[PDB]
């Protein structure tokens, strides 16, 4: 149900915006849209989350303002804008949907195939 | 942090005891209210200090006494109490023996001081 | 064996006196507060959970009491208007007045006292219909409170702006706060931190809608003592503001009348330009989305296919049937039925609310102390953030909710729900292997 | 601000029998733990949530338990079911009070 | 009993000294009066504690000093004072030397502390 | 005289320390003012006593600690400080290290008490 795009090569110091489209469900309901990245070597870490019911978002400490996460229920998509990119940011990026209800609360149950960003 | 040790075990928490100690003293609406609050805060401080005086623990954060543990109060092991429990949990475990222990501590101190005078008079 | 430890990090639930602090002629005397800490600290308590209950929180009671007492102290030096309890000879204002506003303003005249005991003066002023009653069933009228209470003029130099205050614990106490973004007011709170002082809280007074408070960070929250009990209120906190724009589009004049040595009364003079009805505008699309969010969450307590209907308030006094507020110094009583008129089924524009205005106010629902609000010259415009609602259940597949008023306490427990006061108990004992 | 430590980084077995994976939180997370199975070529699949509840996309072979800050995962019988990297995920950040802040430990490679 | 030892002899009474010590801290009519009374009770408590501090007897119910009895204050025998007299009677017998003894105790303590510093500096 | 030692050198002045210590405790206009003043005087007294407690100097006018002088605070000689300077001058010379020294004293006392318990437990 999640389809990603916007991957590719970034010249160091540049920017890249990733997108993740919902299909089969609406982002207008209470879900978390989060991005994680998998480094070469398989280290896995969280990047950011946005609550679609409000636009509220949280970022990983290592971001330090370089990433912006946002959503639009009218497109039924979510995006991640990355800036000041370097070689260290090479990773497969993935979007996933977390539930906001009692069972599976904060649990990522829906994952899309990710997309590669190199710098 | 003033209550930062609240989640620590007893054997870990009792190293930062001065953190809380330092924060115990720190006619219109919001006028008379402050005067009344200040007086009561002072009274609370003094009652605790008087008890440490009576038990012979004045001036200390940690003091040993000569009163035995009676077991029935809590039959837990020292390695269980100090390493796997917090002070909030402990306070609940023996809350109903508070008055027993305090009475025992007071009598012990009176006996000790009388005996010291007998030796200084020798 | 017994070791006594002092400075033990434990606490118990407690009730004490809190004092205010302020970050610095105001009706709440906020200048009388202790200056705040420019950079207050907050300590996270790792591995500590605590049990909270917003319905039994005595911090609400102190806030309620401080507000009323401050309000009363602020009127102590103000001029009394007892010489106005006279027979007023009075007629209607008909000059360039909009229909459906016609009959609201009256032109009254009377014999008022003056500087000297031996003299009387003939004066006239305008009054709103809601402040007078007819006695001679021109016609004779009297002010509405002359048979029940004393009327005191609010001092014109005193502000009613809801400047926030912070509550702070005294030495020996601490305030615990919940951080859980979904906390519903009672029970265990998995993430707790400590503060010495609360966030600033604005002493805003309203009825059906809450006009300038905090928003929920994530989801829309519904809180109630019971939900099930139809005698209880439901407090609904929005996670987005709804913008409301209110106006009193009448350019008024103001004049003073000397009534005795050192004393004067402020009277509405006349109207410059046409006479129009006061009103408030609520964005329509925002209101519609906001209710949709509330309904999705209300259904969690009533059933998956339960129909939710909103209806307007029941009959009674304006003070309990309308949305009231103090803004710009005027007291508005607005008709909210346009906001509660829909049925929600399982599976640019605006809403205009007409408003009424009163000058004689029984502020805390008490009887015997009436305040007179002097008129304000010029034109008044206000913009505010609706942050929440007070709803009740009108009580088999359809539930109906109505807005309603409530105690003043319910407008404050909505901000203080996250805070608890505890006292610190530094002595304790434990077995050790040492002996003196 | 929750840091999860996962160990061993490499776990192996003969074909047949069980292995375990442990995970330690830096702070109690009050059982807000999820376990994921990531095979090469895909995103992680959710097997277990809220410490011990299965997603039904996984059989009883994958069992686990824990509380507070310490949890374990047991794979009861390894039939070369996977060559997955297993990950320990915190779904609740107690320093914020939300479910919007996630943390992952490094993973464990299971070889059989 | 708080004053229960009043009829006891001095050598009998001074065994229950904590009984009295524990009871020293314990805008309308009957409003402002309590606030004023509480403050004064605190001041009295502190003045007595300060004197014990100054004389080197802090934390004790009974303390020996190094000040000699000058005889002229009371030329009674120890067996007479401690066994055949009460504290009320004794207080009357030497009431007029109170200020003499206190002055002597204060100077002695200052000399002792200075000498201890000289030894710790050695 | 209460401030009589103000013109004395440090090594001369610190012999009359009890003179100042003894003078620290000593709804209408001139009504409510006295009640407020009394409360604040008590609070000041207690804060100073609490610090002496925390640093392990309770009950003393002069106490040695085990905290080293760090030199950079003041690189004067002992014969210069104690004999050719007054306390007012000294207070100015090291006024900006007050908080450093107090923090060091507090930690030292906590370490000492923990070590004493380990020995009494042996
Ligand atoms: C919800 O919050 C909003 C935002 O804080 C608040 O709106 C504010 O209301 C105050 C009072 O109505 C406005 O302040 C006035 O602005 C006009 C602009 O020209 C000034 O002229 C006014 O000054 C006169 O009146 C004062 C009254 O005490 C006198 O003291 C002064 O000497 C002048 O006579 C005054 O500054 C303020 O501008 C708005 N804010 C905005 C952004 O418009 C709103 O009222 C709150 N809602 C409720 C119900 O409380
Ligand atoms: C909250 O609990 C956790 C564990 O339940 C504590 O973690 C310990 O932190 C110390 C820090 O050096 C480690 O040495 C321990 O090994 C950790 N525990 C475990 C089980 O590994 C944490 O410190 C606690 N928080 C507080 C305030 O004590
Ligand atoms: C003061 O006068 C008012 C006005 O006449 C009285 O209020 C009325 O009371 C009757 C009683 O049935 C009601 O029907 C009217 O509707 C009331 N009028 C209004 C404007 O509410 C009031 O009761 C009088 N107060 C006292 C103490 O007698
Ligand atoms: C609040 O406003 C509504 C409509 O703006 C008023 O409703 C009207 O009330 C009369 C009373 O019989 C009805 O006949 C009309 O049909 C109502 N109109 C609508 C659209 O429902 C309501 O009375 C106002 N409330 C007050 C107290 O004035
Ligand atoms: C009141 O005085 C009488 C005697 O004058 C005290 O009696 C003594 O009680 C003790 C109790 O064991 C006996 O050992 C003594 O022998 C008694 N005295 C005599 C002369 O026999 C009595 O205790 C006094 N009351 C108080 C409170 O001390
Ligand atoms: C004020 O300063 C003078 C000297 O500057 C001090 O005089 C000293 O007094 C003592 C008293 O025995 C003598 O032994 C010293 O020799 C004197 N000093 C000199 C340089 O001779 C005087 O005491 C000071 N006042 C105070 C209060 O200390
Ligand atoms: C004044 O208001 C009353 C209300 O019924 C109305 O009957 C009367 O005609 C009005 N008078 C004028 C002059 O409009
Ligand atoms: C009230 O009556 C007086 C009488 O002359 C008139 O001048 C004044 O304009 C009237 N006010 C209104 C608002 O009609
Ligand atoms: C003032 O008193 C006189 C006395 O006759 C009366 O006629 C007049 O109507 C009164 N005026 C008003 C405005 O009440
Ligand atoms: C608030 O949440 C707790 C969580 O267990 C629940 O028990 C309680 O009933 C809820 N409050 C209401 C009014 O339902
Ligand atoms: C109100 O809450 C109490 C809590 O025990 C419950 O027993 C009672 O039934 C509730 N009221 C209704 C009408 O359910
Ligand atoms: C409310 O909307 C009407 C629509 O015509 C507008 O005329 C009026 O000025 C608006 N009121 C406010 C307070 O903006
Ligand atoms: C309130 O006034 C502002 C002024 O820019 C306007 O943008 C807003 O839409 C108005 N709100 C309503 C409800 O009309
Ligand atoms: C919200 O807008 C939709 C648009 O079709 C409408 O059907 C619905 O009834 C509206 N709800 C309210 C409360 O106005
Ligand atoms: C609510 O709407 C109905 C519609 O007929 C109206 O009769 C009733 O008086 C309204 N309530 C209030 C308080 O206006
Ligand atoms: C409520 O909805 C009905 C639907 O036709 C409408 O006629 C009525 O005027 C609405 N009420 C209000 C107060 O707008
Ligand atoms: C009211 O009328 C006076 C007449 O000169 C004018 O100066 C003032 O600005 C007007 N007020 C408003 C709000 O238009
Ligand atoms: C309404 O909420 C917005 C949210 O950012 C805030 O910026 C604005 O100041 C708020 N208005 C009031 C009156 O609080």
From TrEMBL, chain C:
Keywords: Apoptosis, Clathrin-mediated endocytosis of virus by host, Cleavage on pair of basic residues, Coiled coil, Disulfide bond, Fusion of virus membrane with host endosomal membrane, Fusion of virus membrane with host membrane, Glycoprotein, Host cell membrane, Host endosome, Host membrane, Host-virus interaction, Lipoprotein, Membrane, Palmitate, Signal, Transmembrane, Transmembrane helix, Viral attachment to host cell, Viral envelope protein, Viral immunoevasion, Viral penetration into host cytoplasm, Virion, Virus endocytosis by host, Virus entry into host cell. It is a peripheral membrane protein; Single-pass type I membrane protein. Glycans are attached at residues 47, 89, 92, 96, 107, 111, 136, 138, 147, 184, 212, 226, 239, 245, 251, 288, 304-305, 312, 335, 341, 347-348, 381, 385. Highly glycosylated by host. The high number of glycan on the protein is reffered to as 'glycan shield' because it contributes to hide protein sequence from adaptive immune system. Residues 313-323 are annotated as: CD4-binding loop. GO terms for molecular function: identical protein binding; structural molecule activity. Its main location: host cell. Disulfide bonds join 20-33, 20-197, 78-155, 85-146, 90-108, 168-197, 178-189, 246-280, 246-327, 246-382, 280-334, 280-355, 327-382, 334-355. One of its GO terms (cellular component) is viral envelope. GO terms for biological process: clathrin-dependent endocytosis of virus by host cell; fusion of virus membrane with host endosome membrane; fusion of virus membrane with host plasma membrane; positive regulation of plasma membrane raft polarization; positive regulation of receptor clustering; symbiont-mediated perturbation of host defense response; viral protein processing; virion attachment to host cell. Residues 1-99, 103-436 form the Human immunodeficiency virus 1 envelope glycoprotein Gp120 domain. Residues 396-404 are annotated as: V5. It is found in: Host cell membrane; Host endosome membrane; Virion membrane. It comes from the Viruses. Envelope glycoprotein gp160: Oligomerizes in the host endoplasmic reticulum into predominantly trimers. In a second time, gp160 transits in the host Golgi, where glycosylation is completed. The precursor is then proteolytically cleaved in the trans-Golgi and thereby activated by cellular furin or furin-like proteases to produce gp120 and gp41. Transmembrane protein gp41: Acts as a class I viral fusion protein. Under the current model, the protein has at least 3 conformational states: pre-fusion native state, pre-hairpin intermediate state, and post-fusion hairpin state. During fusion of viral and target intracellular membranes, the coiled coil regions (heptad repeats) assume a trimer-of-hairpins structure, positioning the fusion peptide in close proximity to the C-terminal region of the ectodomain. The formation of this structure appears to drive apposition and subsequent fusion of viral and target cell membranes. The CD4-binding region is targeted by the antibody b12. Belongs to the HIV-1 env protein family. The mature envelope protein (Env) consists of a homotrimer of non-covalently associated gp120-gp41 heterodimers. The resulting complex protrudes from the virus surface as a spike. There seems to be as few as 10 spikes on the average virion. Surface protein gp120 interacts with host CD4, CCR5 and CXCR4. Gp120 also interacts with the C-type lectins CD209/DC-SIGN and CLEC4M/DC-SIGNR (collectively referred to as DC-SIGN(R)). Gp120 and gp41 interact with GalCer. HIV-1 lineages are divided in three main groups, M (for Major), O (for Outlier), and N (for New, or Non-M, Non-O). The vast majority of strains found worldwide belong to the group M. Group O seems to be endemic to and largely confined to Cameroon and neighboring countries in West Central Africa, where these viruses represent a small minority of HIV-1 strains. The group N is represented by a limited number of isolates from Cameroonian persons. The group M is further subdivided in 9 clades or subtypes (A to D, F to H, J and K). This is Envelope glycoprotein gp160. It comes from Human immunodeficiency virus type 1 (HIV-1). The gene is env. The chain holds residues 34 to 500 of 860 of the full protein.
